[PDB]
Design a protein around this ligand. Structure first.
Ligand SMILES: Cc1ccc(Nc2cc(C)c3c(O)cccc3n2)cc1F
Ligand SMILES: Cc1ccc(Nc2cc(C)c3c(O)cccc3n2)cc1F
Lengths: 523, 523
């Protein structure tokens, strides 16, 4: 039985093949057939290309030697061919499905050491692909090349498997040949669909016509964890991924940086430097007990200090729920520090200066009395998160009846939005500080209103996005209707059949909405 | 006696004053004298400008109201005026000198909430200035304005000082008036030199004609600390500051991320995202005991994984000593991941394939035997660092005589390059893992040579800088003479009267050299 799948890069995981550009250049320039392909393979295992593929020489050293075997521009031809080569999405998807089902996956490729001025494009491609596989074996790093028999024995050694346990996929029959002679299952890849039919048939796993997959998530132990002391007793923790303009993600109640797990790899891949916060009172961030430590004024001031200490003059701020509330106040009180602002679910409603704030919000009154909601929420963490984190149809949820979970099961079923593993991550995070810090975010209504009244004559004029979730019953889309009065250039997004837990309910659409808005309005 | 100094921003810490552009526009457009200055102050404490300065309205909301009081472009005039306004360097220098001598320093300014498309320029200015002061009091954040008496009582309250203990500096006599009526020492700032003469006279501290100050350093507790697991038993720690292209700083033996303390704020201010590493075996990074864990191949592989996990397709790599050696091998084996490479002191010398590496390097033989050098180096950490970290003339330093510190004092004097506090930072870092991990970097000579021989046919063709230190007797400038044979486009820098500890010996020149090279060759 098969337990490992091995894929080539050029012509298998990445298309169009760089090999196929030599033939196209010949046809475009009306040169003799196979002229450029011949110059490329000139000298066989003794030639310039074999030296390049073994890592003896770099791509820039090879360009003049290739120009020789040819005797326009080889650099220009290869630059265009490398730029045009993109990830073969259905092939990646099939590799992803096999790994998910327990297969050890690997990429085995004949490649070079790229020192071209434009090497970054390829570096980015390899980075995106590699994260999805157990191993990446590059000819130029191992000083071995396909079809030499040693690279295959090296592949089996790294895989810790016998040939009969390995499916090997390649677009070059000659490179496929030694794997077969060893006893491996082999697929000659010409067109993707037929290759996948062959793969599906031999593995007994459905790979073709499969349902739309969820975006890539985060493994906590694989992330870069950052820590910033904003004041003597206050430290802020964040997860960081990517390069480009800074995008600060702000979760709600009772959440985590992990609530953005589906957005982090997507936003970093779209060209942003993502900073996913543990908001004050949560996870690895500090959780002081005092109520006043959680008023909007102090939270926003600490987020400014967080930027100060990291050396960031600005960040784009994206918030959900209480994070969405924070983000509107960052835009109103610190516009110089906010590149752009986006809120998921939380509308921006100016404070009524002629009315106190306490005058679907029975939840907020139950949360007022210190200790009451903490007692109920901390009693059984697994139950708390399983009851809370549910889609619109999964509804398991007043104050009065004396509690949030009065007519709720002791052992709720697992929502379709989460796995048992993901629930347990939240359980482990909440074991450190409990619910006091998180609940204090609701305990500053009067302070928050007083502070908000100072902004009543202002408008939000920096780039802004409001994202509504059709089926959020706490933060209803209708509550955002008058926002344009205060944010005239406000851009919008809307997600149908989406509950309160936007990021995990509808991750694909959240990502589509944010990336499109970031690229048009945030740089 | 004075213990606090308060500075205005416009016309004091930043020049030319934004107020002085109204008069220049009037003269350029041949408009009636004081026309634009009059429209600006129209309505007094009831006017549009007072509302803007109190934070009732944002700059973008104020532009149309100002256009009104005027009845070209107000936005255009202010955009140019804000862009032109730069930090008043000698004034900042004097504020820096007073704080160093125990003064509580603060900025008190009449400013606005900037929501302009180009607000970043000012956000960057405020960030650079603020880090150097105890307090920043902005009119738009406190809803109070100079010359109203409450802002002055608020300033005294934040300062926790009585008026007679405060020197207050302002370019507007009317704004200076209430501080004087309270009993504060006041300086009307017209020209900088005269203002500083007045400041020097009243404080009794030399501020004018003072020696060239060292670049801004790092306070460890004020930095963002990052942590990346590169493999099960290996975690890498780094300090991170700034935005822009990633610049990875790699220290030598027996050093720390803190060895780059003078480069971190300078490089971040020049527009780079600095990642200052604790190299494997050092500080908060993991220190496994095994020798093989420290061969160049594994170290370079882990640095690639560090980039993978942070989502960085490339970084510019800058190394000193053993970090300089690592950085040349990153360029040779991973060019796709290296934006540009720079080495301080460490030359690039290709391996001799016909000769073993063991055949000024008596230090390296003494370091070979596990436990010997650890015993001597760990015996007294304060003595180890005080003896090592010295300028070219301070020389307190064979193997034979049986030791590194044979004819060295038990209590060495403090080098001019370091403070007692800085030595103690290194002492505290080294208390965690000792010298085993650091010394293992010298214990892979044969493995490193074997790995290096695979690169003998390659050239370094990506952007590269070699920086030589005249008085480094281990890594002598003459050892770098043939480097061009392998790095043809190699750029150079040279530092005279500089010992082995380049960064702390000559910080100003290191920064000048790196920034100039980064801006021309690294983006
Ligand atoms: C159970 C529950 C209730 C409310 C919220 N979210 C919010 C968010 C904001 C922003 C609120 C708010 O601003 C006022 C009152 C209640 C609020 N509830 C989240 C929950 F998990
Ligand atoms: C005491 C001492 C000796 C040498 C070095 N630096 C180096 C750096 C490299 C890079 C070396 C090397 O490559 C071979 C042998 C010795 C080396 N010494 C640093 C010290 F603090």
């Amino acid at each position: 039985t098969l337990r490992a799948a091995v894929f080539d890069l050029d012509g298998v995981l990445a298309l169009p093949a760089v090999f196929g550009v030599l033939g196209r250049t010949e046809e475009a320039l009306a040169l003799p057939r196979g002229l450029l392909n011949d110059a490329f393979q000139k000298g066989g295992p003794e030639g310039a290309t074999t030296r390049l593929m073994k890592g003896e020489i770099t791509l820039s050293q090879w360009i003049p030697l290739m120009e020789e075997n040819c005797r326009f521009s080889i650099k220009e031809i290869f630059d265009k061919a490398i730029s045009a080569r993109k990830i073969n999405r259905p092939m990646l998807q099939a590799a992803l499905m096999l790994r998910k089902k327990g297969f050890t996956t690997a990429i085995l490729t004949n490649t070079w050491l790229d020192d071209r001025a434009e090497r970054d494009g390829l570096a980015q491609l390899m980075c995106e692909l590699k994260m999805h596989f157990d191993f990446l074996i590059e000819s130029c790093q191992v000083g071995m090349v396909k079809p030499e028999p040693q690279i295959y024995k090296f592949l089996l050694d790294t895989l810790k498997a016998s040939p009969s346990e390995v499916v090997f996929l390649d677009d070059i029959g000659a490179n496929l040949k030694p794997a077969r002679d060893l006893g491996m299952v082999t697929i000659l890849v010409q067109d993707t669909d037929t290759a996948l039919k062959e793969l599906e048939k031999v593995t007994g796993i459905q790979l073709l016509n499969t349902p739309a997959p969820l975006p890539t998530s985060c493994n906590p132990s694989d992330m870069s964890h950052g820590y910033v002391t904003v004041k003597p007793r206050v430290r802020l923790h964040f997860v960081e991924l990517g390069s480009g303009p800074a995008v600060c993600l702000c979760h709600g109640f009772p959440e985590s940086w992990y609530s953005w797990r589906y957005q982090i790899p997507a936003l970093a891949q779209a060209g942003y430097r993502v900073l996913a916060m543990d908001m004050k009172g949560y996870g690895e961030s500090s959780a002081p007990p005092e109520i006043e430590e959680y008023c909007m004024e102090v939270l926003c001031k600490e987020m400014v200090t967080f930027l100060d200490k990291l050396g960031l003059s600005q960040a784009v701020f994206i918030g959900h729920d209480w994070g969405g509330m924070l983000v509107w106040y960052m835009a109103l009180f610190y516009p110089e520090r906010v590149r752009a602002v986006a809120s998921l679910n939380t509308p921006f409603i100016p404070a009524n200066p002629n009315m106190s704030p306490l005058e679907v919000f029975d939840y907020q009154l139950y949360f007022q009395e210190p200790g009451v909601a903490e007692a109920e929420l901390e009693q059984n963490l697994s139950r708390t998160f399983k009851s809370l984190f549910r889609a619109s149809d999964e509804s398991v949820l007043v104050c009065e009846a004396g509690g949030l979970f009065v007519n709720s099961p002791e052992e709720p079923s697992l929502s379709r939005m989460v796995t048992e593993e993901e629930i347990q991550f939240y359980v482990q995070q909440f074991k450190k500080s409990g619910f006091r810090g998180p609940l204090n975010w609701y305990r500053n209504m009067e302070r928050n209103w007083k502070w908000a009244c100072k902004s009543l004559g202002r408008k939000i004029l920096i780039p802004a996005l409001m994202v509504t979730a059709e089926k959020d019953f706490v933060l209803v889309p209708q509550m955002s209707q008058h926002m344009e009065d205060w944010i005239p250039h406000l851009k919008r997004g809307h997600i149908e059949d989406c509950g309160h837990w936007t990021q995990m309910d509808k991750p694909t659409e959240v990502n589509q909405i944010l990336i499109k808005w970031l690229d048009s309005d945030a740089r």
